[PDB]
Amino acid sequence: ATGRIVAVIGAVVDVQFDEGLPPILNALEVQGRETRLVLEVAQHLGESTVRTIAMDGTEGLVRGQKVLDSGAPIKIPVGPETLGRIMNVIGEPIDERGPIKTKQFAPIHAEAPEFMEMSVEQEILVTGIKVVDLLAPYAKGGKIGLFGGAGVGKTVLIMELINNVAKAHGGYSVFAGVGERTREGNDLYHEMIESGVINLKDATSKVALVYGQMNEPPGARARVALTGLTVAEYFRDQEGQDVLLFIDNIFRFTQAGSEVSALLGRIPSAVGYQPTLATDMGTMQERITTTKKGSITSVQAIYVPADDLTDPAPATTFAHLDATTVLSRAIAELGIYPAVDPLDSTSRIMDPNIVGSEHYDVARGVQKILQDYKSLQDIIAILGMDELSEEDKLTVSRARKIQRFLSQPFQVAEVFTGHMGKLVPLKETIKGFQQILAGEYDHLPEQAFYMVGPIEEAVAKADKLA
Amino acid sequence: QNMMRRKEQEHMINWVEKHVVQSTIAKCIADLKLLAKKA
Amino acid sequence: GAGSIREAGGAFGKREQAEEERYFRAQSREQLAAL
Amino acid sequence: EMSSILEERILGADTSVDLEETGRVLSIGDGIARVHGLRNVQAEEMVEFSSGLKGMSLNLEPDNVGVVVFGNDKLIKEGDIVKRTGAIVDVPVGEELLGRVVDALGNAIDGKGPIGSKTRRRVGLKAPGIIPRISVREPMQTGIKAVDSLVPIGRGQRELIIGDRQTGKTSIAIDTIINQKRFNDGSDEKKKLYCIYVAIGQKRSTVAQLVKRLTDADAMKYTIVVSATASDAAPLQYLAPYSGCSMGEYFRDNGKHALIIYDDLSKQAVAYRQMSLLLRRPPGREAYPGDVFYLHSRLLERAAKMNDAFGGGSLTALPVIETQAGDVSAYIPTNVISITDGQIFLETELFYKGIRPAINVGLSVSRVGSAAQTRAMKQVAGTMKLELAQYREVALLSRGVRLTELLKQGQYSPMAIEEQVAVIYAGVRGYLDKLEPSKITKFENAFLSHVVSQHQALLGTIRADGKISEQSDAKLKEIVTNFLAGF
Amino acid sequence: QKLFVDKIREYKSKRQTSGGPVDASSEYQQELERELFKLKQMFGNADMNTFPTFKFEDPKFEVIEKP
Ligand SMILES: Nc1ncnc2c1ncn2[C@@H]1O[C@H](COP(=O)(O)OP(=O)(O)OP(=O)(O)O)[C@@H](O)[C@H]1O
Ligand SMILES: Nc1ncnc2c1ncn2[C@@H]1O[C@H](COP(=O)(O)OP(=O)(O)O)[C@@H](O)[C@H]1O
Ligand SMILES: [Mg+2]
């Protein structure tokens, strides 16, 4: 079927088909462009007219230009050949290494796995990070989210998770860059090349990259998450592998949806967001899940607009995650990195029957003492430290020691802090925090627990400063 | 057993349908006669 | 806007309630003795 | 099988064709189809698209009909044929649904075959009037100490569970559902409560985990789970509460007692907001439609307690509301607080202080209160409530700390009312102002083990009478003093 | 009634499987064995076609007299 463009407003292009109106979600190809401009059908308007969304720039589109319907949604190449490669929203190689020679192509618009395919196993995934492993432990095959405002450490934390978990993994990994800095994508590509994870000489690559960044029109930023989803879904279903799916940033999906919804002729909802925010987010997030045909350990960085955790997009994305790692700016100002908010990060495997009574008790005691310190904060700030009882003074001292101990130097930060990166096993974390809670270190200064690995290093730093 | 009984049966249910479409103007006559019975 | 420390309900309001009512409970159990 | 797939799955299939009134899709986008024709279609009538889909006719405009689609609008094209059904939206109701997981329209999604349902029931029916109802007297036992003691719930009441994210609302509902196991397999018929759980906008693996928790405790043989998860269309998440409520009204109208949990209603309000914004209806506060209060009130008004001339049935509702940063003064939270008969406030501050369940007893309310309690639990809980108040104003003080540490409870551990009243007895009569709080829970674990191992006759008399008689009070004094000596 | 007979014929024609037990599967065996493998790692690793072996443990004891 051949239509003709009858309207162009930003990323939204109306096409009028004289015969054979294409279904919704189809992919149309514009004729007469230097490169490939794909329009994704979004609505039917009547009068044999559809309202599409362009995957690339729309400059130079004339009213009356020819548009052919391909007959299927956007199809990307999937398979073991996409490993070590980079592809854009529509599945074209953007690494100047030639085509991607796969045997099968999968549409980026698939149905979510049904209810009877869900698996319920909740084994723990150890990361090597103190606060994460202690208070909000991750799970193999669960959905993880790293919330946080602008410049608090979402990307540093996700690169630390890649360093600790991705290369130490057995299955495959997929990194979908959704609306982030292109220089970060270049950094990741070259880091994975030097680390042997991506091998340009043979087929031993272990990561597939999908990149539509913040320089892309809103259609590409809205569908590149789906492209990454589709690659990971192939690696889960057709291979049975255990896949790692990293998404940064998943908020740009909703933001681009809002940008295009402005022009799609829809009454806006709260904070000017699309009326279909939660439904689109659900149809996307219900595909990122572990079934009984394979597991997908998903780590998604979630930007928070204006540091407001009640914004519709993060407030809607909370309900899709098995473990949330909420970063904070108030904690990041204190130099405590990672800035994970201990009294706001949760996990569904923080359960004594799962992690053990010892681990559960240590985590809950740490959280209780931090909540006590938080309750005291007001009086401490106004009437000074003196007016506390000595019990309150001891609670405050232990809580500040725990706050310093939750900090940790990251192996990815070896270039802008100088300190060696510490990877703390789970036993060291539980033991150190149990000891600090028991009062075994009420003589060391609080600056001795700052930016260390296990508790022995805190003791050694306390000795070194004296 | 229940795993094999399920997939083999749904493969069975898929075989017959893409087989019948592979496999006659009496229908157009039957449709004309069945339409008169609506009244 | 007087009484705002108690209307807020933060730390300085809860301790106001505690201080005041412990004082008055002591005074009440002492006044029940003199009767 | 080998022949049982044609014998009646084909030979019996009702392959009749009939003259049906139809319409034609003018436009379709974002799940809202504008159908030209259907001159005789009724308001809120279920229609059927040529591609097997289904939809409800909401807007009846002069030139078209606004049909919301129960599914994915990708399969619908302009010029498609929309055929009438002639019936307003209805769901299958019956006792066969007990043990099934269904979606918002009553279709089985657990892969166990069709539901053997004989009768159907509308979803937008009218709640009972003033005459068919009677006072809420029977107690709905949750098994949670704080709820069953300080915020008791009756049968026919609408108790709101409200709090922020990850504070323990779903866990309260799951404990309440699991606890009814003792009554459901017992002998007394009018103590059986058939639970219903509606999952609205939740992740699908969360509902899978929940079904696993409820089948591990063998609590699924009497539970219906309606699930309109996040990937389901907005009309399905908007219709799930009404479908579940009709499934419970079946029991309520036939002399039985049901319980329904809407988890949660914030997501139903969001789905309704989307569905109504896409119908070009003017938005109100926070872009919600004007009639969202009506949306929730006509749903929570169907949880009633009928009199004996109507069977004596019941339907207890436990709506769940999520609040943003503890803001209880929002639009939808204040609506549902105005509708319900009390609240169960959960806080994250109390949750992280070791108080789990984090039920704020200061703010938690039960507008029916004592009328929904057994006599023994009432006798102990009056003094317990007053002592806990007195402690909360001066935060005696050691007795109050002992009582709060008594209120703490584990997850998926719903006690009996007899054991609950024995524990709060051993707490309020003074036998615990001698222990240090760090061993209080230890004492209660060991004490419950000892009592259920040795003193089944005292608890049997408690369960039979309902009062802690002077004989029972004396024997319980004996048991607690002897065990305290042993400890 | 081309569709009355076809649904009963083609299924009766599907009874022509005694030679090929999977009704002329013609594919999906490559992924069928993956299903049981996922099912096997769910039940463990032992060969579930034979009787289970056993090794029975004994309690840990000491001397409990008056020291
Ligand atoms: N009574 C309890 N005791 C101990 N832990 C609890 C208790 N209730 C809940 N939790 C834990 O606190 C967390 C809260 O889970 P829950 O689903 O019950 O809260 P929620 O209100 O449904 O939040 P959300 O729906 O946003 O996930 C869970 O990890 C749960 O294990
Ligand atoms: N774990 C950390 N250790 C040391 N510095 C950090 C850490 N996390 C963040 N930072 C600092 O804060 C800055 C923010 O980094 P980034 O992860 O890109 O934030 P975001 O991606 O959320 O915008 C970094 O430049 C870094 O200097
Ligand atoms: Mg970043």
Ligand SMILES: [Mg+2]
């Ligand atoms: Mg919940």
